Write a protein that binds this ligand. Structure first.
Ligand SMILES: CCc1c(C(=O)Nc2cc(S(=O)(=O)N(CC)CC)ccc2O)[nH]c(C)c1C(=O)CO
Length: 125
């Protein structure tokens, strides 16, 4: 079955607003979210519904853009790099579970390319 989704709130962690964090939500995440190939990445992989029973045997650090969006909205991240790492994990997981030429892999490649173009103009710390 599925694990619970990743935590999107931490009550023992302080919160701050930064130029970088605002950009990550309003520019980076927003732009990826609206991409034609965003849909497989907008929520946790539902392995039960999709009948992918080995998915969470193979992927022990799942991540998705729905989670990332909620983390940003909830001020879950203190440092911008925490958010960037989550995107990286999300992409890397595809390359672990799937094979070259799989639809999902081509979709990940397009999103990652876009992600890098957007992170390029990330405001300074
Ligand atoms: C191909 C499986 C997969 C998805 C995915 O989500 N595929 C998906 C979702 C649904 S759906 O019913 O849940 N659905 C309604 C359309 C989405 C809102 C239906 C069919 C699907 O192929 N994502 C990732 C990262 C993977 C990986 O294999 C990654 O290693």
């Amino acid at each position: 079955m599925n694990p619970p989704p990743p935590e999107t709130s931490n009550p023992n962690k302080p919160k701050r607003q930064t130029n970088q964090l605002q950009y990550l939500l309003r520019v980076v995440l927003k732009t990826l979210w609206k991409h034609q190939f965003a849909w497989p990445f907008q929520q946790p992989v539902d392995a039960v519904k999709l009948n992918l029973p080995d998915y969470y045997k193979i992927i022990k650090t799942p991540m998705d853009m729905g989670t990332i969006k909620k983390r940003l909205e909830n001020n879950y991240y203190w440092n911008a790099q925490e958010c960037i790492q989550d995107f990286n994990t999300m992409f890397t997981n595809c390359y672990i579970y799937n094979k070259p030429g799989d639809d999902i892999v081509l979709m990940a490649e397009a999103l990652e390319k876009l992600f890098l173009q957007k992170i390029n103009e990330l405001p300074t710390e």
